[PDB]
Design a binder for this molecule. Sequence first.
Ligand SMILES: *[C@@H]1O[C@H](CO)[C@@H](O)[C@H](O)[C@H]1NC(C)=O
Ligand SMILES: *[C@@H]1O[C@H](CO)[C@@H](O)[C@H](O)[C@H]1NC(C)=O
Ligand SMILES: *[C@@H]1O[C@H](CO)[C@@H](O)[C@H](O)[C@H]1NC(C)=O
Ligand SMILES: *[C@@H]1O[C@H](CO)[C@@H](O)[C@H](O)[C@H]1NC(C)=O
Ligand SMILES: *[C@@H]1O[C@H](CO)[C@@H](O)[C@H](O)[C@H]1NC(C)=O
Lengths: 485, 484, 484
Amino acid sequence: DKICLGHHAVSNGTKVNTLTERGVEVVNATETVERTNIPRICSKGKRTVDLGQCGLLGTITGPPQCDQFLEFSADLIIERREGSDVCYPGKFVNEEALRQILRESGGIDKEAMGFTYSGIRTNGATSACRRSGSSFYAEMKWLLSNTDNAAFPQMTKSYKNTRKNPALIVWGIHHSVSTAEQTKLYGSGNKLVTVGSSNYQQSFVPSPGARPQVNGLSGRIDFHWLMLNPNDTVTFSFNGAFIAPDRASFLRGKSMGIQSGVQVDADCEGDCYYSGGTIISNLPFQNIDSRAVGKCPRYVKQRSLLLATGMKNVPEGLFGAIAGFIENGWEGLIDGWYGFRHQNAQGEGTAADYKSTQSAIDQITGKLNRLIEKTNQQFELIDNEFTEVEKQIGNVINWTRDSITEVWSYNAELLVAMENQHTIDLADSEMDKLYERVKRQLRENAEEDGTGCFEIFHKCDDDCMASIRNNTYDHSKYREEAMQN
Amino acid sequence: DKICLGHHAVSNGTKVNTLTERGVEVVNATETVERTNIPRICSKGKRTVDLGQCGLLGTITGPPQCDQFLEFSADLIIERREGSDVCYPGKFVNEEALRQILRESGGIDKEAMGFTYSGIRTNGATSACRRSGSSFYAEMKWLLSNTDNAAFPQMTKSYKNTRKNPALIVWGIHHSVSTAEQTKLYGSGNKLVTVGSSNYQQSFVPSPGARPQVNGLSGRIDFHWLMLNPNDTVTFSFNGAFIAPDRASFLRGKSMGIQSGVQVDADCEGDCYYSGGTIISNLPFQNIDSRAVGKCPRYVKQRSLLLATGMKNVPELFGAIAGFIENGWEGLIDGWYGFRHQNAQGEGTAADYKSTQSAIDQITGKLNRLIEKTNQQFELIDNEFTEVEKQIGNVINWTRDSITEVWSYNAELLVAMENQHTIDLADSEMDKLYERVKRQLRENAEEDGTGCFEIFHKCDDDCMASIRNNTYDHSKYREEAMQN
Amino acid sequence: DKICLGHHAVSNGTKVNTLTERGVEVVNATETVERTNIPRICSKGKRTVDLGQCGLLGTITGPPQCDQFLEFSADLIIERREGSDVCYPGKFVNEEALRQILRESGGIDKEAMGFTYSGIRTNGATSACRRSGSSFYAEMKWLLSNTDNAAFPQMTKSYKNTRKNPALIVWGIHHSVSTAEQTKLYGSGNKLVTVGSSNYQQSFVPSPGARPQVNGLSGRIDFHWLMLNPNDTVTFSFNGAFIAPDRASFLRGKSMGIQSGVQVDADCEGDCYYSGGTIISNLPFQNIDSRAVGKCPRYVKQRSLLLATGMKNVPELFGAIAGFIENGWEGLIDGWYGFRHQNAQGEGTAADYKSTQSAIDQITGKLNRLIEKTNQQFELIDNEFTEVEKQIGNVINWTRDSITEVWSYNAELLVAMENQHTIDLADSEMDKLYERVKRQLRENAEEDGTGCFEIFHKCDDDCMASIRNNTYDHSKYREEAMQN
Ligand SMILES: *[C@@H]1O[C@H](CO)[C@@H](O)[C@H](O)[C@H]1NC(C)=O
Ligand SMILES: *[C@@H]1O[C@H](CO)[C@@H](O)[C@H](O)[C@H]1NC(C)=O
Ligand SMILES: *[C@@H]1O[C@H](CO)[C@@H](O)[C@H](O)[C@H]1NC(C)=O
Ligand SMILES: *[C@@H]1O[C@H](CO)[C@@H](O)[C@H](O)[C@H]1NC(C)=O
Ligand SMILES: *[C@@H]1O[C@H](CO)[C@@H](O)[C@H](O)[C@H]1NC(C)=O
């Protein structure tokens, strides 16, 4: 009569990596690196504004394509590649900083700045900024001389921020195609604009000259901006070539901005976005895109990092039981992880030990619950996919992102291998612990055969075997019949 | 007659986190994330100059509030929120870069540039820079036309650097409230400035215009600065609207610049500073301020990460602790592991010094390895008072948040891993003591299953003592014990 | 008659650091932090181009020292400290960004813009750019005026990028010594230069003024650059003080840019370069230069981190090594673990191949996993020769120091952890061998406590050999040994 101990096993198994070995077949494993993508912008539960053809900066100045976003409000702002910030040819200074400001703004709220004028024309328009006939930026005023070639009077206009949050102030310098046109619109003489506050202090002079035609015009209206603190006053002093602001902008609250090219899905929910869609995953790592934003798994270079969720698969190592003095595993033990297999006059019985199985299962389960977590830290865009940022700061950004990518790749690899080593050694420890427990139960009534079996030197029926398995065996009841050998 | 052996335990332990479980009670644990803060700037043994109402940049130009900091010398420079770089309204170009240059300069040393002026007037003053009545920047001079109008003659002034270290040259451009004021101060037509040294070059045209009233005045004097190399000659070609430099600045040595709002305490000593005070700690992590400077523990998001310094606590890997030994002994106060024998003379409970001192030395080794101090000093690249450019600020915040994530992860994983190996370590020591006793008794005792050894012969107190200090001889009792 | 289990040892081991102990002697160890460097630039099979006295930016403008590099092509670009971008005194705007663009460009390819001028001069030369006598930049034209004092007409020359890649458009602004010189060269009045396109706009103006002379000349010709997109059109509207471009530059492919001061060696091959030479190593870390570029081991502050490649050395966690086995056998030079038996035929000592090869395979796996090459190439964002802006330089230095801290911590923790698991691993193997012999002897032998087995029967040499190769039948001797 004998009672052997063993562990389960499967036919195929799954290879993993450890601290000492590469390609260890374990019974079960799960992936930690996300490779699956939702090719949509999951926007369920979030106020979403798809800008489309309106550029994010245009919402402050107001070209015809931005007429519906002049006072938008959203939790998720989507920039599109076909978006344009300007109707009249030009660009912004410190454009990317303002884009990053508006992505988190949660929307904008315009307020009249109270600029009245006397002695100049205030209805400059163009065929590029076309609404009905010929129009201009909805939030701006193209100030021209009162008549053709007349002298533009020296003016100075101020604005007080009576609110509790800073205001976004944008003005424009007009760059004519020639000095003759600048005199035609503003009169002869040098033109100068001065913008001053308590934190800002800059001056601007236009630059007449020929340029390649953009949208059909060779002039260039450029836009500049500042943040006016509460109770602070902004002052402009100008005598021509000045696009005056009409309404200031105030940030509503909180949001996040992404640049994408896939459709919006209001029935899907997500928190991690990139240009190709939404990354929905509980895994701690992802190998989709290093520039993902939101609450995302850490980007890593590796495509797959299998974490072992089971013992070493030994079909037909610190503690020497699994894949040790126990030659192989039991492919039929589908009842648990560790188990008993007895042979007596009734012969051949296989049961499972619930305590050790549930112990290893609880340990690996706690490990998975520790690794499968959420990073509540949100990251926003500092790069730009449609309009590349400056070369130097872009190289610094790329360098930093690559360094962090190296760090997280290392931490992910080392983490996976280490946890796999501890998993295998842990299951081994549980097998050896169960074996030691049975040896301690039988005491002097049985002997070890070296293969994990116990030679019981007395007669042990199915009730006696069941007495061994549930720790009700009393060695003194057999300490003489068994010890007669 | 039996001899048991076990481990110590306490009623109220300390819950820690491990690689495989959260809330494991251990006997003892220590904190690795610092939270206590000294509400003062510990500056003992350091030359400290509190700028107060004086701005760091003003020390180069010299407003009335910086007349005593014109040649300061310190190891720790402290910027205050009430500081101001100017008395006449204006601002510096590349102000933050110059601030970072002055923070680590160890002070400044001025030297007369030797500018003499024939013709033009050089005593321009204002009611914003008040000393005696109306004064100007002590290191600058306001050049004006000879009379109340007419012409300001074109002039060129050149300075040569006769030092071995670079010099700090700071000049100023004056922006009048209107064209009429510029014509009154310096003359009708265009005003032009030109600064040239090689590896530098620039021209400047003033921009008259109405600015908001700061200190009652609407003009704006904005300051520019270059760094002269040895033997390098700088030349200024101007004809008005030029704030001339009177003395150049030289960097003394090395210091550190912090921005705080708490008082200075020369009683305590510290090397890690921030706005709220001084972080004096030996712990490797801190959750006080992510922008701390100097030699600091690495900032982490977590506010508490308990490191286990004891075994698993079991009140009343290797399977001894919390395994076949059902529980621990709160009475065992002499050590971590011990014996408890039951014979004929009574009951005994002693402690084993080898295993206890072994585990204590091991966990002590972990402690010594973890509470390491980093000799890497980090400088200030942000500004709590005057916010930097939005783009470079977003990049700096982005990098700092990335590093914070890295160190938070490393701290969590380190704590959990060290706790796991600590519990497994103590368990291993218990198992090793048990196996040592088992091999020591040989065939004269048996295992009952709960960490005890039934001795099948009479074993008095001296026999138990022989078992404890490993002087027990099995052949002395083999003949009697074998019969059972 | 007894049979003992043991492990090897050496007289003088190597001390390493573990998670719980500093200075643990192990049998063998290997270095993980590289210090040795080849003091040459190993560019075997890379087509190098050593600029020498030519500056990297000059290859776009074409001073006399860059005449042979006007259309260079390479995979590794080496900048020297003696390199100069200019022959006439001047500099570049956004020079560092353009240098970084040219380092990874793989070379440049020039193409004639196709500019034709009328009524003006186009042969402006100088004695500083000395080819035959007085010359100028090969890729530039110095537009002047015919007589000593005429007037530069308002001109506008445009170019259209006809190729499917961006074009580098470098023009120049001339800054004269005085107003009289600028009027002598270009006429009189306010001179302006405008460069427009799709991603660009700007506004350039000269700056006449007194200036110290470099190379005997006080003028300053500065160069500004542009990146036209395919099908994009650039336009220049100028009226004087304009150094016109001649040919445009196109990036050939990809390359690497390093700054070094050592000779070039076409024999050795390397992928990691720094100012001192080439780092040829497979170790995961290096303490040579933190600014090394290419595919390098990660820089760390520590100079040496010894990885344990053997068991703990015990001369004369699982309790076997340095435990109930008192010491190791220096005479066991046949393997890691071995038997030492004593019977009647004499005294024997053999080695066990299973456990030895097992531990060797595990530690070999650790070495194969740690000794790994990083296929991530890092470019040059600093400048050892010219230096960059102070603010972006402080940000770059700050980020680099942070990453260096992270990799130093990870290196320390990695080495200590791997050493801990290695020692515990070999200990585990020894214990497993011991328990295998214990289970193998069944009831015919008894443990002695010091790692040996007292055999209670007569076991000759063939019986010992049967024990060593797992062919010992305990039933052969069970009746004989049971009687004792
Ligand atoms: C394998 O592990 C995964 C963990 O994600 C678990 O969901 C699955 O049920 C496991 N399979 C078996 C057969 O235990
Ligand atoms: C940074 O990398 C992206 C791709 O990851 C590339 O498009 C961009 O051009 C890089 N930045 C610079 C300045 O080249
Ligand atoms: C508990 O750990 C702390 C760690 O600082 C130590 O100071 C203290 O002495 C320990 N207490 C005991 C009873 O070991
Ligand atoms: C960076 O973070 C600090 C607080 O941590 C904040 O005061 C500052 O405004 C942030 N920078 C930017 C550009 O938003
Ligand atoms: C950055 O460090 C290098 C040395 O590693 C030094 O030469 C350089 O001056 C530093 N940068 C700044 C801006 O100080």
